[PDB]
Design a binder for these strands. Sequence first.
DNA 1: CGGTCTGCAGGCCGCTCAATTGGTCGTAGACAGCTCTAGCACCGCTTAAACGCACGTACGCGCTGTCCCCCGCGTTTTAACCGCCAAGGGGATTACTCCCTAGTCTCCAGGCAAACATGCCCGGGCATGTC
DNA 2: GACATGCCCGGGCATGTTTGCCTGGAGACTAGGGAGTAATCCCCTTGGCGGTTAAAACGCGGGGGACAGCGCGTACGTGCGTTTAAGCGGTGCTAGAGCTGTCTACGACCAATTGAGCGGCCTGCAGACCG
Lengths: 96, 96, 108, 108, 94, 94, 82, 81, 200, 200, 200, 200
Amino acid sequence: PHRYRPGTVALREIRRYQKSTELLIRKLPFQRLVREIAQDFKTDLRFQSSAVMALQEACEAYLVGLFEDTNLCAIHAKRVTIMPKDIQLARRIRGE
Amino acid sequence: PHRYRPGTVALREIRRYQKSTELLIRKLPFQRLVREIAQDFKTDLRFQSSAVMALQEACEAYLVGLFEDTNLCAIHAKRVTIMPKDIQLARRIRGE
Amino acid sequence: RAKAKTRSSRAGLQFPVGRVHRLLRKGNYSERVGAGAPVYLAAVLEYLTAEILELAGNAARDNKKTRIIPRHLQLAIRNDEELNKLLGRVTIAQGGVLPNIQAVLLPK
Amino acid sequence: RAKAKTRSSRAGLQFPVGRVHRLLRKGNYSERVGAGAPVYLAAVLEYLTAEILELAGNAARDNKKTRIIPRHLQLAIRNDEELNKLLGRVTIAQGGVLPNIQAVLLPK
Amino acid sequence: RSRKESYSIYVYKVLKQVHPDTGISSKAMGIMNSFVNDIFERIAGEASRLAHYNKRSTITSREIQTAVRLLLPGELAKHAVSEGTKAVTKYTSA
Amino acid sequence: RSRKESYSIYVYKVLKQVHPDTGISSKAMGIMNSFVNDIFERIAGEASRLAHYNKRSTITSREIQTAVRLLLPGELAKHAVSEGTKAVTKYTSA
Amino acid sequence: VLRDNIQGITKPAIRRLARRGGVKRISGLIYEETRGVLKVFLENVIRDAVTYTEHAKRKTVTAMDVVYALKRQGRTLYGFGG
Amino acid sequence: LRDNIQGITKPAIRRLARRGGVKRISGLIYEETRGVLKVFLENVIRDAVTYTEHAKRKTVTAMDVVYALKRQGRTLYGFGG
Amino acid sequence: PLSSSVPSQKTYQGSYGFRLGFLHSGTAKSVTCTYSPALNKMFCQLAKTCPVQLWVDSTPPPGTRVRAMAIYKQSQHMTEVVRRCPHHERCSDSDGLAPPQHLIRVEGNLRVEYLDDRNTFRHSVVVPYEPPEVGSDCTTIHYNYMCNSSCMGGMNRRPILTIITLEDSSGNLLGRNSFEVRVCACPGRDRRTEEENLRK
Amino acid sequence: PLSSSVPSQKTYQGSYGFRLGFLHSGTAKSVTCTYSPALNKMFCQLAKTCPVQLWVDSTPPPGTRVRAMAIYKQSQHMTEVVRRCPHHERCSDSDGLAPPQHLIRVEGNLRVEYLDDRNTFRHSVVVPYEPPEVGSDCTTIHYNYMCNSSCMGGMNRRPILTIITLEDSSGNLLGRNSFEVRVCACPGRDRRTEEENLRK
Amino acid sequence: PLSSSVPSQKTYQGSYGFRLGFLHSGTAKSVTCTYSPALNKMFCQLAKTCPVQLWVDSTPPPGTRVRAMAIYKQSQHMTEVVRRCPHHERCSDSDGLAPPQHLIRVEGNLRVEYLDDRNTFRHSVVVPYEPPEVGSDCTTIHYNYMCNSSCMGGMNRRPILTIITLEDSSGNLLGRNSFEVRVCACPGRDRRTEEENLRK
Amino acid sequence: PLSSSVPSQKTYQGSYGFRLGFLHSGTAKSVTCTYSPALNKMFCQLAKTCPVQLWVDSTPPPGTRVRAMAIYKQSQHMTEVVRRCPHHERCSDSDGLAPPQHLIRVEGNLRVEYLDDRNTFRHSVVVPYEPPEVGSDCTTIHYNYMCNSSCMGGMNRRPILTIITLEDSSGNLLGRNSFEVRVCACPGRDRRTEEENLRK
DNA sequence: CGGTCTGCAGGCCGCTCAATTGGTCGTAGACAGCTCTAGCACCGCTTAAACGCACGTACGCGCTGTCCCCCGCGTTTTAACCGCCAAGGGGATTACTCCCTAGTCTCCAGGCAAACATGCCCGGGCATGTC
DNA sequence: GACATGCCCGGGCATGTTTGCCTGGAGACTAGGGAGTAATCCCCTTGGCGGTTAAAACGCGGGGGACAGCGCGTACGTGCGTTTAAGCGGTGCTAGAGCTGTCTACGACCAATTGAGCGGCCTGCAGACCG
């Protein structure tokens, strides 16, 4: 038999997902999350499909950029694993 | 004999410089630096006295904020001494 | 030809309504300005103005000074969470900084 | 009347001077707009448009496509640090990202 | 002097209604003037865009009211909205 | 149906100058329309303030030129200025 | 959260996102921290978009409502109009 | 003029870092700090001069500096606004 | 008429550290009351509000009172009772509390008492003391001066001193301060004049 | 207080050709009394001698009397009684002939009389008429004005007219004349000022 | 005190051509009496000899008398009785003929009379007239003035007129003349000063 | 009249260290009162305020009084009682407290007493003594001199000494001081004149 | 099977509607020249605080070793998403009609600062007394 | 004759009211924007069934993360010595700020021409008939 070590396919995944363009999150779960949030401000609101798609792309872009900074922070600590505090540091530096 | 233990003076300096509000950069040198830069774009440029002060306060504010973020980065690496890497990391996270 | 009432007085405000009416109507903010618009905005500015001054006056009394100074404005703005958003990126002349010392730096 | 000619044709531009003139007169940007103003602006927009499309065409060719798709815009923009800076806060629909891996992560 | 209309008078009166004993330094007053102009420009700017987005020619209390919510944190926004409401409500009623 | 406008025709014409054999997808064309509109808004907004600060009422090629230099990186600015200069120069001669 | 709507952002999905950011290795605590951050981002954008929709007195949120809401937070989105 | 970048002395750099809570400083910080400061200062100057050139003046005023700062997300209070 | 005695004008801070204070008003044309620390002198318009602050290092006992009395600054006139001039004494401007002849009034206080001293013929006005309100370092009394310094038959251009005495429920002295007063049409012009003449 | 009526100021020379005359005094800064023909106005100091000449074409009968009375020149003040101010009313300056409150006195003449009119509340002073000496052409009366025009509670800066009436033994009107009066510290300066304003 | 009336001063030469003359004395420092025609004024010392010449065109009847009386020159003072001041009135300088209070005396004449008029309160001195002596066209009377013009409480620097009347046995008027009098110290200095000022 | 005796003028500080002081007034022409240390002499106008300071090393008992009296400085005249001249004695200027004939009055003080000494015929004025406030070194009395030094029949240009005596409640002598006095219209001009003549 | 003609789909020509261009007229914003003043620029001398350099000692940073748990990858099982389809109505959009608001123009009252009018005190000259 | 002593006029300061300039509000008239109603129909929401990947779960093993230890250097602290910044002052002129005058420019309107879309007509491709 043949198999890889913990921490191998993860690197091939980096190459693959950096290369593609499609969404990495699922469609229906996201729609519900949007509406479940939106109803807090006002009930019965309707949405254009394009509106949801816009939200998805903005969210993915935001998170992916955040992960880049998070990754740099872990490298600065000379780790390889990312930690919640790595995220917190990057956000705080960015004024959030 | 007596000498203060290293760091005990630093903590008192931190308090004093946080507490006060005056400019930390000597004014005449700063003014020369402004002109030394500006000349590279245009000779003979006159400056209002107020304009020079406006520049200086923006610069000190910028550097002071930069150092605080730098300090957090070093703390995140569980050092106490700051290094050029900490400065670079903070700036890079802010997209500079 | 009845005796006039100044427009700020009529609203109960201190800020001068007629000024705002001119200002909104220039700088090309719009083609037209409605009569209630300046009144609404004057009140908003007046409210926010009061909040800053109130906090700064407390900050002055803490230092036992009779007069508000730039430092007192800085303290007010940074101690209040909401002002620290609205004015988050503002730089204030001679503002100084909060006495923030990280626990890891303390002597032990 | 005389045999007319289009303003864009006179300037040698592809972009429509007349539309730009209308737009500048609205948006409440100003009370008045000068004759050369839309002419100068149209040339600038056309120039920047050409730069993006040229780099995007090269990117498309490297992927053996004969048609530009959003992904090729994304890569082309990032490969020119000048445009990367100009658009440093733009999100591109279906843009993807750059294939960057940090050296410390590669195996040894 | 031929210079722009400051807000110093009203700022001073507002302070007197809050802390009647206190005074203001020249620099503190200058700061408050910059502050008023800043908030003014933001609200007027956003109100402009609201009208532009909606293809409508006239700024009203609503465009301001909406802009106030977009610009201010929610706590400040509601108090500001209450005051703006009253001022207009009274002014039209009186 | 009611009437609408876009830059799609001109984008398509420009592409054939740089790559005569290359088409453009409507998704990409959407991006380009957003790009044109964004740059337009920036230049018009900044030029407006230049006139405002200098108390002029009229936007000219100078305000646009200055705004371009404030917005664009230096290299792009130099070329953009050259093209705008020629366009106005030729238009004046034409 | 209703029927676990936030959990609808699954563990593998979170993995895939971090991969684009070059993340090689992930601690298990990351998933909940990510979800918190994501919700804040959505809450702020949705709230502003709804505010635009209410101002127009429409009852359907359109793409332009989203595009404006994103823009003023310092982030401009191309392709969805605007 | 020349070399006034050194006029930003090592103690000046200490005092700035101190206000930022910095307790302990490595020697290379001095050189790194000067580079960063220069870039920030230069970019502000360049914009302010560009405004001055548009007004066709030969003198920079505080309002040019204010505008130059402002657009970078740096609203400054106290010098007019 | 004359008085059998002269009130003491000597400064005395006493057990409670008693001092006076005054508002930091400027010297513009439209000023109604302004005070000069360089001269220790108040400049004010007739019948306008003249705020005087009371400062202490520790709080006096309950039942403490504050009294104001005017005397002529020049020693030969000190035995003449400072009073309103015959015109302002006859005019119908009494507030229902103050007698027509008294120069100094206190506005806004219902516990005010006006004394025409049977033994000295001196006029004075008295109020209870109160400690500062929460958030204040001092207590403010609002005085009014009911004749100009130039009133003929009255003060007749002679400068006056207002003497302020902190006193107990029996009238015994707890603390004393004084300030010169000019009552005039243009307090800012006059104050700047006297502050300029201080360099001559 | 206010009178029920305003005395007539209309000039009336009557059967005897009655007119007034005044001395040719200069305009030295503080001359005690001087008269302006251009203004028909007397300028004089308080309590000082004010010579008024009486001119007639023929001598009135014996028992004829001369009266002087003051009214305010401005129509809005004409109903107020011209009197001394509350200060000069209380001063002890009576000559043993004049009441304390009367504005106008006649000096020198032992046969003077002072009237407070029971109906109109107006004050006035009266003397017997005397004819000129054999080679003279007019008779001189010496009036004194016992308050300044500026006296507060009295004239209060308002200009007055002095009305002179020639009367029989029962007060019946034989002739009437009038002149404006200003009672001031510097009659010469003030007269030159008012005569210079006549060219502005 | 005041008099009820004023004596007439009008020049009246009458049936006898009455007129006055005076000696041609110089203006030296040590001079006691000197007269100025340019001023119609006599300058003299207190209590010294003052020669006045009586001139006539024809001789008056026997029993004619000559009277001298003083009045103040300024018309407002004319009703005050010219008398000696309270000092000279008390001092012990009477000659046995003149009452202590009379200003004008005649020396060298035993037939002099001094009148204090019960109806006018005026003082006057009288002597018989005598026709001129051999070698003179005029008769000389020697008067003395018993107070200086400057005497306070007396003449008080006010100028006086001496009135000389020629009269019959009943005191009816035969003629009248007058001259101004200054009683001083240094008549020569004063006469020259007033005569020099006549060119200024 | 003449007194039977001459008051002692000898300076005597006594048990209480009694001394006199005077203000540092300048020599402007008509300064109301000014004092010369070089001459030990006061120069002052008639009836005007003359401040005299009383200095002591310790406080005299209650009931102590201060008396003022005047004598002629020249030994030939020391027996004559210094009094007002006959003019100022007759004039109606009494303040309701002082007799007509007294040269020296005290103004402002209601507890003043005036003595005409039955044995010596000397006039004097007396007031109770009062101590200064604890940080002031002297008590000021304000005298008035009611005749000029030049008043004829009165001082008659003869210089006077004012003698001030501190006394107990029975009139026994506790201390004595003196100063020369000139009463004149121009105290500043005259003081300079006499201080200049000190070099001649 | 090869050649010619007709109908449908795509392209071209004419008409309609809209946008752009050309030309004429009107009113002002911008450009130009001028003047006056303020602030900036440049230089000097003095006083002292800050900066520079050197020396000594310690706390920190860096590298190594050892231990354990957490994360990765694989295989199996279950759940939910995605795709295509169908139905119903609400909301958005378009067109048409009516009323109120804001903008523009003209007129009146109030608010804020400067100049003049008038009273009080001291000095100079002249008038008068003394030696 | 020289000096000593008092009053009037002139000069300056002290003390209050009137006049001038700028700003804001109130009233009246004209055109467009906003508001309301009716209608059309597209898009969104809701529901169904089937297919299949993705997600969830559990196990085993290895690398990374973490904690502790030791060595040497880099930094901090303090002393003595040196330099320049700050302070205050002096002198000179360029440019900023404001005003006045005139012109060319841009806004506005109407008329004409071309472009884009739609309707009608023509050409090519696919199908039918003739040689």
